[model samples]
Target: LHKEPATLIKAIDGDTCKLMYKGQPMTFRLLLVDTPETKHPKKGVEKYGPEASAFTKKMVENAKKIEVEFDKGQRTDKYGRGLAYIYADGKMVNEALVRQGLAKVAYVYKPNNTHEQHLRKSEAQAKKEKLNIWS
Candidate 1:
């Protein structure tokens, strides 16, 4: 896995976040998960957006460690933001959010789908339970 250790800086939203990686600030566009938009540009606040942002912020803020796993696909998007799956204190942030239905499995592409099965399973369970976004 192409992983880089990082420190939580701030939550731009539920899906976009800032981190200090290798002594530099990097904005990461979280992979395989799409959460409601609380702070999107020109986009109105979506339902459950604040809740999802709050949840993601709290989880990463207090974690002892955070890591970013880069996918085999394009490492950065058009804006040059990092694309990766994040882990906080060994808990995968992508799966965690999706599992709780605060996020959905999205932006699916080849090679970057390492956790597709796991995320889909989590999404399915959340849908079955009708949690948050699913509800």
Candidate 2:
């Protein structure tokens, strides 16, 4: 968390996203979840691929000045940008994706798990209710 971003730009996929921080560009992937692919090999296509992408777009549309919280690994991806959780108005955008059934819990490498339990809880709710694309 050495540097916070200046603006929250947009979410690309459930896993990858872009941010404009401190007049610099940053790309972030959701810490733990890997959602169904829009076009993938093992999973084929997800139920709400477009919706998820659209949801992410809406989540970060026309916004500026957000809080970027880093995990144990801070600001260093293969591309060269900060990897962290994007928060706005105290609500975690990452959790919002899972809560909305846009993304699933996927922790790879070191695992960004700040919202793991919460994501699981949200998954349960989505399962029980059969909301969104999952339905």
Candidate 3:
């Protein structure tokens, strides 16, 4: 889809969000990655967790338009929400978080391994730079 970029409406957490374009809501799940569960019993919010959410909000909360790209798969998840990659002013925000050490690449064990290397590099850089949440 070569549709024009849309403005981000909200950041649900670190890896999920809502986008508004033409008065419609588009939900995007950043492809190939998952961040620590913001609200999970098994795991509490990690370091920089609030910072991650805040950073995303700062980037997309009021922008007039943002970019979103999708991987090659279904248009919706089980809940019927549209999946997409997010960008702002040509910046790949999804990957940017990983590169900046806020998020991590997560892979589903169903035969897809496309973003592993990219995610690895991002995580490695994050570690090397001491950007770990706890650090």
Candidate 4:
């Protein structure tokens, strides 16, 4: 899987961010993990939403370089935002977030479960460590 190099443009929420891919801006909802809600009107700021948002923003913003890799047949969401795995300096941001307990391994699209095992393992380790939400 080739991770196309990109840079952080904005971190919209815990699980979503904007990136400049190939010199063009694109919204990316990181695949495989879902963080707390900071945008939904009804769901309105769930527990640890701000922290999750902060984490994504901080990590991406601090990175010198980032990259994106799309899952099989998974390119966009219903809102037309791109879906992919974001890496910060070659580190998997999605998995790291789950590992930190800031993200939940939600929205398991069967055909597009590209890195399911690692994601689950991250979540399990976080669960065991009782980080963030799990705490």
Candidate 1 lDDT over residue span 8-62, tens digit each: 8878888899889889998998888889876667777998889888888999998
Q: Is candidate 1 or candidate 4 better by TM-score?
A: 4
Q: How close is candidate 4 to the true structure, as a TM-score?
A: 0.95
lDDT of 4 at 46: 95
The Cα error of candidate 2 at residue 8, in Å, is: 3.3
- The parts of candidate 2 lying over 4 Å away from their true place are 1-3, 39-45, 62-64, 74-81, 108-111
**Model 2 root-mean-square deviation:** 3.1
Clashes of each: 0, 6, 2, 0
What global local distance difference test value does model 4 have? Answer: 0.88
What is the Cα-based TM-score of model 1? 0.94
- Candidate 4 per-residue lDDT over residues 1-135, each given as its tens digit: 677888787889988888888788989898888899988899999998999899888888988888899888768989988989898888898998999999899888877788999899989999999999899
RMSD in angstroms between candidate 1 and the native structure over all alpha carbons: 1.2
Local distance difference test scores for all models:
0.89, 0.67, 0.69, 0.88
What are the per-residue Cα lDDT tens digits for candidate 3 across 1-135? 443677667788777788775579877777666666677667788666777777777777656568776555565677656666677766666677887778877655333444557667877888788785525
TM-scores vs. true structure, each candidate: 0.94, 0.75, 0.78, 0.95
Indicate the worst ten consecutive residues by lDDT in candidate 2.
Answer: 1-10
Clashing pairs in 1: none
Q: Candidate 2's residue-wise lDDT over 64-130, tens digit each?
A: 5467777775456676756667776555677887788777766544555555687789877877777
Error of 1 at 129 (Å): 0.4
Cα lDDT for residue 102, candidate 1: 96
Top model number, TM-score: 4
Q: Which pairs clash in the backbone of model 3?
A: 6-66, 33-106
